[PDB]
């Protein structure tokens, strides 16, 4: 199974395969580039998450953003009942995921931040 999300680490990880990738050790200090994920399916059965080699802001994916600054809880944002939260570790690599099964009332978007040194990569998810 694939994780619909972004791998910002430079490890060649086997436990986890993401749909998108963007090596954080590439962008300018105190700047950001985005790695966007769009999901559009009738009834889902997907894992969503990221692999961050620095620090994750906020505490995704229980907390997500709306430079973002509005911290929100994912259960309130997607407004679905059963959301499974998962995590993994590979040294400094931090893998935070969430599983989503079923239908979604309203199309919702949210952002999660991977920060490494002065460089921060954003991951914005849209789900219809």
């Amino acid at each position, epitope marked *: 199974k694939v994780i619909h999300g972004c791998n910002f680490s430079s490890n060649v990880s086997s436990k986890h395969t993401f749909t998108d990738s963007l090596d954080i050790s590439l962008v300018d200090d105190s700047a950001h580039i985005s790695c966007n994920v769009h999901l559009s399916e009738p009834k889902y059965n997907h894992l969503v998450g990221l692999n961050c080699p620095g620090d994750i802001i906020p*505490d*995704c994916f*229980f907390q997500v953003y709306q430079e973002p600054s509005n*911290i929100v809880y994912l259960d309130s944002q997607i407004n679905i009942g059963d959301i499974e939260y998962y995590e993994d570790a590979e040294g*400094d690599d931090k893998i935070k995921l969430f599983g989503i099964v079923g239908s979604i009332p309203k199309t919702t978007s949210f952002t999660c*931040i991977c*920060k490494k040194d002065k460089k921060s990569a954003y991951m914005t998810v849209t789900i219809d």
Partner: antibody
């Protein structure tokens, strides 16, 4: 305003245990990292532990890894440092901090509380 | 990881200026933000510089930070010294999962 009111340290014999508290107010407790930073009398700042917004990330230096445990209770807006297997080298003034993770710095500090490990 | 090394002490007369260095032993000083903390005797620390050169609210522009990428060093500068500037000053930088402090610098405003 923002407040970090640290609670009660004391004297401990080596190998004992002790719990420090920090009551936080004035800001959304769930949206910030928080740390403990100590200082032995006459010496410099030494970071002790950090915890992310709601526990997603926890960091320790090897000097206390295995002996100290950081935690937080969002329903009491309180930071805790559980200290076990205390050594005399742990004698210091322990400070409570709120961090801005995005800018890698401690923006508010507590008043400190002294911890003495002596036999 | 790395170390941050400051001078043991600095001193100058009121109204004069003083600069306190923070030399990163390995890696690039420009890679991670540097922050600076003031500690008057018997008081808890307070931030005077964050993000290399940003001032928190309540810190006059007499305080300023800079970064020297060739000497691998950060600097705190205090001009127009006043008596209440007399403190211990600490530089701080963070790498992933490690928080590093400088040794500290005693600032004596000569009286």
């Amino acid at each position: 305003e923002v407040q970090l009111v640290q609670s009660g340290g004391g004297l401990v014999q080596p190998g004992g245990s002790l719990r420090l508290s920090c009551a936080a107010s004035g800001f959304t407790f769930n949206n910030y990292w928080m740390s403990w930073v100590r200082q032995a009398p006459g010496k410099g700042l030494e970071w002790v532990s950090s915890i992310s917004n709601i526990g997603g990330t926890i960091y320790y230096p090897d000097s206390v890894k295995g002996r100290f445990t950081i935690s937080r209770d969002n329903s009491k807006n309180t930071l805790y440092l559980q200290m076990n297997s205390l050594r005399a080298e742990d004698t210091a003034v322990y400070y409570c901090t709120r961090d801005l993770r995005m800018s890698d710095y401690f923006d508010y500090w507590g008043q400190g509380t002294m911890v003495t490990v002596s036999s | 990881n790395f170390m941050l090394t400051q001078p043991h002490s600095v001193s100058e007369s009121p109204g004069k200026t003083v600069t306190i260095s923070c030399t990163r032993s390995t890696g690039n000083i420009g890679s991670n933000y540097v922050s600076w903390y003031q500690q008057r005797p018997g008081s808890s620390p307070t931030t005077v510089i964050y993000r290399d050169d940003q001032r928190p609210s309540g810190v006059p522009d007499r305080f300023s930070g800079s970064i020297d990428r060739s000497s691998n060093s950060a600097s705190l500068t205090i001009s127009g010294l006043k008596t209440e500037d007399e403190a211990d000053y600490y530089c701080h930088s963070y790498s992933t999962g490690m928080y590093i402090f400088g040794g500290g610098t005693k600032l004596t405003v000569l009286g």
